[PDB]
Amino acid sequence: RDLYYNDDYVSFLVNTVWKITKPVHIVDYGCGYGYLGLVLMPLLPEGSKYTGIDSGETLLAEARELFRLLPYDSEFLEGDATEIELNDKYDIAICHAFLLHMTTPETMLQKMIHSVKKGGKIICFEPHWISNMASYLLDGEKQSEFIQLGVLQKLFESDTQRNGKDGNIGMKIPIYLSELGVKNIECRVSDKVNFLDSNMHHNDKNDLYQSLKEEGIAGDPGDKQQFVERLIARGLTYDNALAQYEAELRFFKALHLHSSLVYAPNMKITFGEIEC
Amino acid sequence: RDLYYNDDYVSFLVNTVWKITKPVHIVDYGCGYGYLGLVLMPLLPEGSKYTGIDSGETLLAEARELFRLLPYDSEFLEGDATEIELNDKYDIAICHAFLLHMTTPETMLQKMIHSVKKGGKIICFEPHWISNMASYLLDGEKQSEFIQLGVLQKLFESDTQRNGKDGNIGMKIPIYLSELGVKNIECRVSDKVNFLDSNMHHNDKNDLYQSLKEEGIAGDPGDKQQFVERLIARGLTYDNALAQYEAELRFFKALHLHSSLVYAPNMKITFGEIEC
Numbered sequence A, B: 001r002d003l004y005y006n007d008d009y010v011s012f013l014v015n016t017v018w019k020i021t022k023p024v025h026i027v028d029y030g031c032g033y034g035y036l037g038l039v040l041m042p043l044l045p046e047g048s049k050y051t052g053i054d055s056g057e058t059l060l061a062e063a064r065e066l067f068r069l070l071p072y073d074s075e076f077l078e079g080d081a082t083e084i085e086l087n088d089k090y091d092i093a094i095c096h097a098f099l100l101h102m103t104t105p106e107t108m109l110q111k112m113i114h115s116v117k118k119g120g121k122i123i124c125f126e127p128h129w130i131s132n133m134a135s136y137l138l139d140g141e142k143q144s145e146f147i148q149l150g151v152l153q154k155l156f157e158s159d160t161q162r163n164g165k166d167g168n169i170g171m172k173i174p175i176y177l178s179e180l181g182v183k184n185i186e187c188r189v190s191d192k193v194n195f196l197d198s199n200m201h202h203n204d205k206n207d208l209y210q211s212l213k214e215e216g217i218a219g220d221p222g223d224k225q226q227f228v229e230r231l232i233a234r235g236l237t238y239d240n241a242l243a244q245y246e247a248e249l250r251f252f253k254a255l256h257l258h259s260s261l262v263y264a265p266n267m268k269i270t271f272g273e274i275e276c
């Protein structure tokens, strides 16, 4: 949450850009444990309703227990978002890091749109891995030493061509929304930038490091052979998978609590309106 | 201007993030024709003073004529920003796409800081070419086809190692500011995303295309031989310079008025405070 979005910036989107003043009925697809709800409900007009959809039974159990303690009206539906049939029309349909797992993104977006009432809105929070990866700066190390953008670029394109899952879908949402007839389409990059400051000595700096590691940043690549073979099987040559391995190994050994790291997740927020 | 920043987002930074309520005395280094002033003065408290510094005589002539028609108190000083000696202390020292042209960024930043009064602020608007380049999506084309991130990554790192000019300095400002003792350092990514919509048929869509081209997006690479030799001389191999050429040629031929393009300049806005 606090690693991808600034609290003040999300409030900016809600109150200034989207100008939401009246309570809204929102549906969140692939809500997980209700992340997007924990982010937006506090900023939405009092009286707003939050409905999350997810197939993970355990996830919904955590979500329910989590929102049980909150003063927000929230409900969670268990079911396959690609087949679930809703009976109501919502003011806003949203999702966070959901569409990138869909083999047929456009279709799922189509379904989300159909669940929105005329004059309603659709907001998608999706990542753009390639811009995310290019948004790294490690003091004392050349980016190309621990991040092979060229290899990553080919790798993410290959995976998408295979199963269909698009890790860079965040920048394509505007186009999918356009083809689907959505109006007033606009995309925005979360303004969030994380800065692990080597000269900041405070508990907050230590907490940021913990969050970074819990997110898997600069994780151990593991067994070299399994790694190279795993990548080669995804559409990469041997010299590419190797360069990638040595790159990840370098990052694993270079990053530590005392380091200076600047990172902008580059999350993509696309929204548009449903033709009245 | 409108290609790199959203009007509402800049106002957000001024009023909500920086919370500037009292009129401020700001100095802009390498102001060019006064771009940053045309952007911030309208949003700053009435009574604010704008002072720009630049070595380009013609540039300052245009700036003066441009601000002559405006209701903002503005003055332009002609001189080398790396040697100019100011007699006053400013509330805020700023710059836009200036530090990337400095061979010794840290030193110039040091000078900017010295021109700021205790309790004052320093705001730097600098680019991050690599994240800018990775932030491209062209419908109907694979990013790796018209943009070689791997080559660009090596290329920009090489240039920096040579003359010292850093095209990716935007993400390093926080670190330079940290070493210089600046407090409350925070970086933000402009939330701007340009979307040339193939399904939008309106004069605004045509204007966006014009702006994109005037900025040099997808420009003709020119003579193949001169191009490859030019890059090789900058620290790249032959197979890299060639891949780069064919990449730029593809973009030049693929992008047109009817295309769907999504682009997030990824400008980096770093700011901090001078200890008082």
Ligand SMILES: Nc1ncnc2c1ncn2[C@H]1O[C@H](CSCC[C@H](N)C(=O)O)[C@@H](O)[C@H]1O
Binding pocket: A029, A030, A031, A032, A033, A034, A035, A036, A053, A054, A055, A056, A059, A079, A080, A081, A082, A095, A096, A097, A098, A101
């Ligand atoms: N057909 C489907 N229906 C519902 N959920 C699905 C799905 N296919 C994949 N998912 C899932 O989609 C979610 C996306 S990952 C987590 C998303 C959540 N909004 C967050 O940002 O934390 C997972 O929790 C997982 O259960």
Ligand SMILES: Nc1ncnc2c1ncn2[C@H]1O[C@H](CSCC[C@H](N)C(=O)O)[C@@H](O)[C@H]1O
Binding pocket: B029, B030, B031, B032, B033, B034, B035, B036, B053, B054, B055, B056, B059, B079, B080, B081, B082, B095, B096, B097, B098, B101
């Ligand atoms: N030592 C120096 N003193 C003043 N200007 C300098 C300089 N070294 C380079 N420059 C310049 O720095 C500027 C940076 S490019 C333009 C910056 C302007 N803020 C804009 O965004 O439009 C140029 O106008 C050029 O004149």
